[PDB]
Amino acid sequence: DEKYVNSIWDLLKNAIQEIQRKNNSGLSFEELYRNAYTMVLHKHGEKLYTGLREVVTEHLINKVREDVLNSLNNNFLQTLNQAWNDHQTAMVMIRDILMYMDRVYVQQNNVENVYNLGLIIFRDQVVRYGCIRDHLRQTLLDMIARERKGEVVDRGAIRNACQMLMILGLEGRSVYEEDFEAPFLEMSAEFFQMESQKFLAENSASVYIKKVEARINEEIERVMHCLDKSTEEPIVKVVERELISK
């Protein structure tokens, strides 16, 4: 009983790790699925579940957490996007392996599914760390300022980062908001506060109106290209309030 369970658990753990390292699986899908299905039937879902947590934590906290920590200034957005793509693909494959878990085991415990569990682990561990939060906020603010200042950056990369931030939360905008939007809102407010005084001093009434319209159009274009569409309206409203009502 227990010895066979341990053997096929070693098998499943090797398969999960070997998937996480992006190589062709030695075994087949059906064998691993049968192993997981038998584990769940015999009410050994606790040990498989904890082993899945251990392996994903080993691959995130001990691997990609230190990768992003060791790559703060070396393509931070690019390495974050690569880690996000790897996590999504790996969790899709693992969720395919463990569908019977989704059908019963995680549903009597009312916990979120394997893909949702992986999303929550990703957000909690490698989204909510203070160092990576401040670094991503700084990088997003620098990219936004460079776009405003006229410097050309990868808009597709920022769009991918926004998509990752939006999907990091469990079907909610809380993650993207508390991660970037508040720092983005503050940076936009400061920039608009400076620009309002600059345009009032340098430009006449019609010229100031034209400058405010151009700034609003630029903000709308930036939102369309490399930002969330849902949060575009509050940003536009804040920009209009700061530029015009001041």
Partner: protein, 200 residues
């Protein structure tokens, strides 16, 4: 590798040959058959064009029928196709099969027997005690005493809060024991109920 599957998929289910379209397998996206044939996983062939699944194929026909259209199995195949759908993780098939009679009454009675998570353990204790007594004493029948109360005994079934009476539990015991093949007779010895099981 992102495999490309033929539109007509030759299937080998534990030595039984089935053939179905690729659209049939991917009909429900959250299913064993859909994830297996989604193309993300490598699928082994078996000396032919057949694709191998290591499970009994006697009742895979009804699973394929439910994938093609809304067809449901007959009565005697409800339980076997339910077992198959559990393996293949076909949620809609599981729901429609649990809405059919052989499993519907079982769910209704599990609503009662779920008040007592020790029911199956106590049943196995009854069977084992009867077998041990019959073998050690070298008899045909073993008589054991059970105590069933709603609010010296070998096996006791404790209190429960429901509208099913004590005599309804004894119906569960005799029916479950008889479903195991045992010949069971129960009598109120005086609340202790004496159970007699005749092995031969």
């Amino acid at each position: 590798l992102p495999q490309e599957f033929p539109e007509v998929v030759p299937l080998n289910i534990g030595g039984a040959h089935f053939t179905t379209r690729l659209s049939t397998l991917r009909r429900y996206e959250d299913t064993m058959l859909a994830a297996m044939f989604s193309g993300r996983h490598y699928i082994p062939t078996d000396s032919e064009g057949r694709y191998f699944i290591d499970r009994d194929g006697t009742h895979f026909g009804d699973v394929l029928n439910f994938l093609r259209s809304g067809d449901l199995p007959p009565r005697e195949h409800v339980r076997a196709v339910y077992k198959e759908a559990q393996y293949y993780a076909i949620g809609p098939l599981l729901e429609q099969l649990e809405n059919m009679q052989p499993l519907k009454g079982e769910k209704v009675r599990q609503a009662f027997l779920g008040l007592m998570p020790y029911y199956k353990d106590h049943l196995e204790r009854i069977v084992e005690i009867a077998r041990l007594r019959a073998v050690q004493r070298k008899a045909r029948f073993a008589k054991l005493k059970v105590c069933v109360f709603k609010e010296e005994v070998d096996v006791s079934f404790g209190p429960w809060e429901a509208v099913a009476d004590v005599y309804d539990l004894l119906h569960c015991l005799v029916t479950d024991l008889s479903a195991q093949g045992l010949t069971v007779d129960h009598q109120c010895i005086g609340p202790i109920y004496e159970f007699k099981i005749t092995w031969w």
